[PDB]
Amino acid sequence: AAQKSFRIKQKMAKAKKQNRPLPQWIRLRTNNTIRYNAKRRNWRRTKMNI
Amino acid sequence: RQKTMIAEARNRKSLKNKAIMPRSKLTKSFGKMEEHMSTLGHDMSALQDKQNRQTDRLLDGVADGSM
Amino acid sequence: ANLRTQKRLAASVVGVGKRKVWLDPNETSEIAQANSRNAIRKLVKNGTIVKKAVTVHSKSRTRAHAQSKREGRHSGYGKRKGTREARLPSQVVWIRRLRVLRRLLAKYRDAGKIDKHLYHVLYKESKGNAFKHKRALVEHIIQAKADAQREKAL
Amino acid sequence: AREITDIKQFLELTRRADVKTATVKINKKLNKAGKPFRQTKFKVRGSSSLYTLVINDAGKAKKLIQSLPPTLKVNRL
Amino acid sequence: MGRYSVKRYKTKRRTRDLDLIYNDLSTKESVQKLLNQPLDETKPGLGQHYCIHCAKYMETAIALKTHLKGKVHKRRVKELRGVPYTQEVSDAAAGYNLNKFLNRVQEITQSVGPEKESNEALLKEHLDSTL
Amino acid sequence: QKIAKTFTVDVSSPTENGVFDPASYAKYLIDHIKVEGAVGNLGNAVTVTEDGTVVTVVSTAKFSGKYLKYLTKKYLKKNQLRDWIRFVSTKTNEYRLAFYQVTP
RNA sequence: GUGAACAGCCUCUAGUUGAUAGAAUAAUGUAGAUAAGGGAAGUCGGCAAAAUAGAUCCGUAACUUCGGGAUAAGGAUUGGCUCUAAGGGUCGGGUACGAUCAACUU
RNA sequence: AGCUUAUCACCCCGGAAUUGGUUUAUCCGGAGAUGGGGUCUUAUGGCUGGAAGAGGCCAGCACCUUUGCUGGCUCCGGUGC
RNA sequence: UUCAAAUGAGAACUUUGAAGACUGAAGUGGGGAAAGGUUCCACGUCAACAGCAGUUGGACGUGGGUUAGUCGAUCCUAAGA
State which nucleotides on strand G lie below 7 Å from a protein beta carbon.
1-5, 11-16, 33-39, 51-52, 54-58, 74-90, 95-96, 104-106
CA distance D66 to E111: 116
User: At E53, phi and psi to the nearest 5?
Assistant: -65, -60
- Residue whose Cα is closest to the C1' of H63: C46
Rg of chain B on CA atoms, in Å: 28
Residue C25 is given by DSSP the state: G
Q: Whole domain around residue F76: which residue ranges? A: 3-104
In this structure, the dihedral spanned by the alpha carbons of residues E85, E90, E92 and E93, taken in order and rounded to 10 degrees, is 120
How was this model experimentally determined?
cryo-EM
Look at residues B32, B34, B35, B26 and name the one whose alpha carbon lies nearest to residue F17. B34
Those residues with Cβ within 8 angstroms of residue C59's Cβ, 6 or more apart along the chain or in another chain: none
Is C53 in contact with C36 (CB distance < 8 Å)?
no
Nearest to B22 among C53, C55, C56 (CB): C53
Asked if residues F48 and F68 have their Cβ atoms less than 8 Å apart, the reply is no
Q: Are E21 and E53 in contact (CB under 8 A)?
A: yes
Resolution stated for this PDB structure, in Å: 3.6
- CA distances in angstroms from B11 to B20, E47, E112, F83, listed in the order given: 12, 68, 64, 17
Q: What is the dihedral of CA C31, C34, C35, C38, to 10 degrees?
A: -130
- Please list every residue in chain B whose beta carbon sits closer than 8 Å to the beta carbon of residue A19: none
Spatial distance between the Cα atoms of C31 and C43, rounded to a whole number of angstroms: 8
d(CA E70, CA C76): 13
Provide the residue range defining the domain that includes D60.
Answer: 1-77
Pick from F72, F74, F37: nearest CA to F57: F72
User: Is there contact between C106 and strand H, defined as CB under 7 Å from any strand atom?
Assistant: yes
For residue D27, give the 3-state DSSP assignment: strand
Query: Smallest CA–C1' separation from A15: which nucleotide?
Result: I37
Listing DSSP states for A18-42 in one string gives T-SPPPGGGGGSTT----S-TT---
CB-based contacts of D10, cutoff 8 Å, min separation 6? D4, D42, D44, D51, D53
Distance CA D3, CA E17 (A): 93
Nucleotides of I under 7 A from a protein CB: 4-7, 14-21, 32-39, 41-43, 56-63, 72
Q: Are C22 and C52 in contact (CB under 8 A)?
A: yes
Instruction: Cite the beta strand spans of chain B per DSSP E.
Output: none
Chain B nearest C-alpha distance from C79 (Å): 29
If DSSP codes are grouped into helix, strand and coil, which group holds residue D52?
strand
Q: Please, what is the end-to-end C-alpha distance for chain E in angstroms?
A: 43
DSSP letter for each residue of F24-87: HHHHHHHHH-BSSSSBT--SSSEEEEE-SSEEEEEESSS--HHHHHHHHHHHHHHTT-TTTEEE
C-alpha C103 chain-centroid distance: 26
Q: Is the minimum CB–CB distance between B25 and chain C shorter than 8 Å?
A: yes
Alpha carbon distance F53, F20 (integer Å):
11
- The minimum CA-CA distance between A22 and chain B, rounded to whole Å, is 8
d(CA A39, CA A19): 9
Say if CB C59 and CB C46 are below 8 A apart.
no
Interface of A with B in 2-41 (CB under 8 A): 20-21, 23-25, 28
- Number of domains comprising chain D: 1
Contact B21 C22 (CB under 8 A): yes
Domain count across chain F: 1
Measured between beta carbons, the chain C residues lying within 8 angstroms of B18 are 52, 55
Nearest CA in chain B to F102: B28
Between CA C59 and C1' G10 the distance (Å) reads 14
Just give the CATH number of C3-51. 1.10.1650.10
Give phi and psi for C109, each to the nearest 5. Answer: -70, -35
